[PDB]
């Protein structure tokens, strides 16, 4: 039925969204970690921040 | 090495962010169930204990 | 000789990276555009009831 969403489905969709966000985060962290000076220039602002 | 350290720092802060998100959301979703007990109705139990 | 070979390899890697950036933009835009093009007409028609 479609009057409401069951708790089981809500939890599964929630953890799927969290896993998707964590996948995006892992891609970002890999992208930052593997930058080489022959491709990228050393961004000083983000370095100061982090 | 600088780039690797930046990645490590981002990894460290985002771990805590993700842990808080996961724990808080799961806890809210399941605490919704913990408070869905059968209402204390003004009736005797169906089966006498 | 190794330095020259590595510079040419780096040029190839740079080209691959530029392609990747362009394709990231294209594919995210296509995701949005398709998600709208499949549903938006019906959802607008139902909202306009
Ligand atoms: C994407 C992440 C953030 C959430 C994942 C869980 C989803 C499935 C949850 C989050 C909020 C939820 C909605 C919140 C409130 C209502 C109103 C109610 O009368 C019918 C169900 C409905 C419409 C829920 C459906 C399920 C829902 C959309
Ligand atoms: C999962 C995390 C990220 C978000 C949680 C949001 C909370 C507030 C949402 C998620 C599911 C929602 C519930 C889903 C369905 C119903 C049944 C409806 O008849 C009344 C509202 C009620 C009871 C919603 C209340 C709000 C609710 C508990």
UniProtKB/Swiss-Prot annotation, chain B:
TM helices/strands, residue ranges: 13-36
Topological domain ranges for the Extracellular compartment: 37-49
Localization of this protein: Postsynaptic cell membrane; Cell membrane
Known role: After binding acetylcholine, the AChR responds by an extensive change in conformation that affects all subunits and leads to opening of an ion-conducting channel across the plasma membrane.
Family, as annotated: Belongs to the ligand-gated ion channel (TC 1.A.9) family. Acetylcholine receptor (TC 1.A.9.1) subfamily. Epsilon/CHRNE sub-subfamily.
Disease in which the protein is involved: The muscle AChR is the major target antigen in the autoimmune disease myasthenia gravis. Myasthenia gravis is characterized by sporadic muscular fatigability and weakness, occurring chiefly in muscles innervated by cranial nerves, and characteristically improved by cholinesterase-inhibiting drugs. Myasthenic syndrome, congenital, 4A, slow-channel: A form of congenital myasthenic syndrome, a group of disorders characterized by failure of neuromuscular transmission, including pre-synaptic, synaptic, and post-synaptic disorders that are not of autoimmune origin. Clinical features are easy fatigability and muscle weakness affecting the axial and limb muscles (with hypotonia in early-onset forms), the ocular muscles (leading to ptosis and ophthalmoplegia), and the facial and bulbar musculature (affecting sucking and swallowing, and leading to dysphonia).
Quaternary structure note: Pentamer of two alpha chains, and one each of the beta, delta, and gamma (in immature muscle) or epsilon (in mature muscle) chains. The muscle heteropentamer composed of alpha-1, beta-1, delta, epsilon subunits interacts with the alpha-conotoxin ImII.
Name the record gives this protein: Acetylcholine receptor subunit epsilon
Organism annotation: Homo sapiens
Source organism phylogeny: Eukaryota, Metazoa, Chordata, Craniata, Vertebrata
Gene of this entry: CHRNE
Whole-protein residues included: 445 to 493 of 493
UniProtKB/Swiss-Prot annotation, chain C:
Homology family: Belongs to the ligand-gated ion channel (TC 1.A.9) family. Acetylcholine receptor (TC 1.A.9.1) subfamily. Alpha-1/CHRNA1 sub-subfamily.
Expression tissues: Isoform 1 is only expressed in skeletal muscle. Isoform 2 is constitutively expressed in skeletal muscle, brain, heart, kidney, liver, lung and thymus.
Transmembrane spans: 21-41
Compartments in which it is found: Postsynaptic cell membrane; Cell membrane
Protein name: Acetylcholine receptor subunit alpha
Disease: Multiple pterygium syndrome, lethal type: Multiple pterygia are found infrequently in children with arthrogryposis and in fetuses with fetal akinesia syndrome. In lethal multiple pterygium syndrome there is intrauterine growth retardation, multiple pterygia, and flexion contractures causing severe arthrogryposis and fetal akinesia. Subcutaneous edema can be severe, causing fetal hydrops with cystic hygroma and lung hypoplasia. Oligohydramnios and facial anomalies are frequent.
Extracellular side: 42-49
